[PDB]
Amino acid sequence: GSHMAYAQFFSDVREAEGQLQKLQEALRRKYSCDRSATVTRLEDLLQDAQDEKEQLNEYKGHLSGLAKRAKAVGSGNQEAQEAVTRLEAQHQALVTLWHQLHVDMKSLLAWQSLRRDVQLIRSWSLATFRTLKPEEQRQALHSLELHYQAFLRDSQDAGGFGPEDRLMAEREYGSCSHHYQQLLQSLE
């Protein structure tokens, strides 16, 4: 009887369907962040979130195994593949969610770090500026240029961040680059 094998195939699917639903709750729980998230936390959570993408990448190779089984059930294989299809769609949805939370965190990281760079340079005094070595000056600038570009990049798809927020970044960025230039012109 191919009925028991057929029914088992659906028990296995119903299992995979529920594991992915449980994984959806895990991500939203851990990786739902706001603008108060510290830098080191966002950096850790981002690292922590890779263990769950390792998971999502595994499912891909399992559903490919289920698709192989779906065809081989014989009696009622049409409705079976229809179930694997419904899984690959559930999986894709979950991959989509991951990337959204990943980018949402990557943007907050880039954002909070951009403020730090601004803080540093706008606090600089002409007196203070003579003290720093040229390598140290350029690198402080290298950070600003880097995280501004990162915020411009990672904030496109992210939530909470729109075109308005990227302007304020350009203003804060332009405000630094001008302050920095004043200090150089001041040296000599």
Swiss-Prot record:
Organism superkingdom: Eukaryota
Post-translational modification: Phosphorylated by CDK1; regulates dissociation from intermediate filaments during mitosis.
Cellular compartment(s): Cytoplasm, Cytoskeleton; Cell junction, Hemidesmosome; Cell projection, Podosome
Tissue: Widely expressed with highest levels in muscle, heart, placenta and spinal cord.
Spectrin repeats: 5-73
Modified residues (Phosphoserine): S125
Domain notes: The N-terminus interacts with actin, the C-terminus with vimentin, desmin, GFAP, cytokeratins, lamin B; whereas both the N- and the C-terminus can bind integrin beta-4.
Role of this protein: Interlinks intermediate filaments with microtubules and microfilaments and anchors intermediate filaments to desmosomes or hemidesmosomes. Could also bind muscle proteins such as actin to membrane complexes in muscle. May be involved not only in the filaments network, but also in the regulation of their dynamics. Structural component of muscle. Isoform 9 plays a major role in the maintenance of myofiber integrity.
Similarity section: Belongs to the plakin or cytolinker family.
Oligomer and partners: Homodimer or homotetramer. Interacts (via actin-binding domain) with SYNE3. Interacts (via calponin-homology (CH) 1 domain) with VIM (via rod region). Interacts (via N-terminus) with DST isoform 2 (via N-terminus). Interacts with FER. Interacts with TOR1A. Interacts with ANK3. Identified in complexes that contain VIM, EZR, AHNAK, BFSP1, BFSP2, ANK2, PLEC, PRX and spectrin. Interacts with COL17A1.
Disease / disorder: Epidermolysis bullosa simplex 5C, with pyloric atresia: A form of epidermolysis bullosa, a genodermatosis characterized by recurrent blistering, fragility of the skin and mucosal epithelia, and erosions caused by minor mechanical trauma. EBS5C is an autosomal recessive disorder characterized by severe skin blistering at birth and congenital pyloric atresia. Death usually occurs in infancy. Epidermolysis bullosa simplex 5B, with muscular dystrophy: A form of epidermolysis bullosa, a genodermatosis characterized by recurrent blistering, fragility of the skin and mucosal epithelia, and erosions caused by minor mechanical trauma. EBS5B is an autosomal recessive disorder characterized by progressive muscular dystrophy associated with generalized skin blistering.
Descriptive protein name: Plectin
Provenance organism: Homo sapiens
Classification of source organism: Eukaryota, Metazoa, Chordata, Craniata, Vertebrata
